[PDB]
Amino acid sequence: GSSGSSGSPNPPKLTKQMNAIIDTVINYKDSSGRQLSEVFIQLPSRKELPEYYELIRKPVDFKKIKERIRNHKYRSLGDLEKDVMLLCHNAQTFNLEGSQIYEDSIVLQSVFKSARQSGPSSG
């Protein structure tokens, strides 16, 4: 099973870490201005595109991932990875390979990992 009440609110050292990563991933750009996270901001409704929810297991978005950090939901950094990686995979599953949205997914990932290290942390 799993347990861990949300007694005290995550510290500034942890919360910040989460933000840094994402804040960088979502802000990360590839084209000459055309961001990628754009197509990863909001998702299609269940009525318009239901099939999406049929194949996709957990169609999560970015607005939700962030809403959690501010909701003291995520217990540890790992949790963030579970979603972040999910929000990406979901795409590679829907969007064809070597496609426009595809490549992006792969990129966002490379940025996520790097972020963890390359951040505001300045000894």
Curated annotation (Swiss-Prot):
During apoptosis, cleaved by cathepsin CTSG to produce a 160 kDa cleavage product which localizes to the cytosol. Zn(2+) binds at H72, H89. The modification Phosphoserine is found at S8. It is found in: Nucleus. Residues 9-117 form the Bromo domain. Belongs to the SNF2/RAD54 helicase family. It is linked to Nicolaides-Baraitser syndrome: A rare disorder characterized by severe intellectual disability with absent or limited speech, seizures, short stature, sparse hair, typical facial characteristics, brachydactyly, prominent finger joints and broad distal phalanges. Some of the features are progressive with time. ATPase involved in transcriptional activation and repression of select genes by chromatin remodeling (alteration of DNA-nucleosome topology). Component of SWI/SNF chromatin remodeling complexes that carry out key enzymatic activities, changing chromatin structure by altering DNA-histone contacts within a nucleosome in an ATP-dependent manner. Binds DNA non-specifically. Belongs to the neural progenitors-specific chromatin remodeling complex (npBAF complex) and the neuron-specific chromatin remodeling complex (nBAF complex). Component of the multiprotein chromatin-remodeling complexes SWI/SNF: SWI/SNF-A (BAF), SWI/SNF-B (PBAF) and related complexes. The canonical complex contains a catalytic subunit (either SMARCA4/BRG1/BAF190A or SMARCA2/BRM/BAF190B, mutually exclusive) and at least SMARCE1, ACTL6A/BAF53, SMARCC1/BAF155, SMARCC2/BAF170, and SMARCB1/SNF5/BAF47. Other subunits specific to each of the complexes may also be present permitting several possible combinations developmentally and tissue specific. This is SWI/SNF-related matrix-associated actin-dependent regulator of chromatin subfamily A member 2. It comes from Homo sapiens (Human). The chain holds residues 1377 to 1504 of 1590 of the full protein.
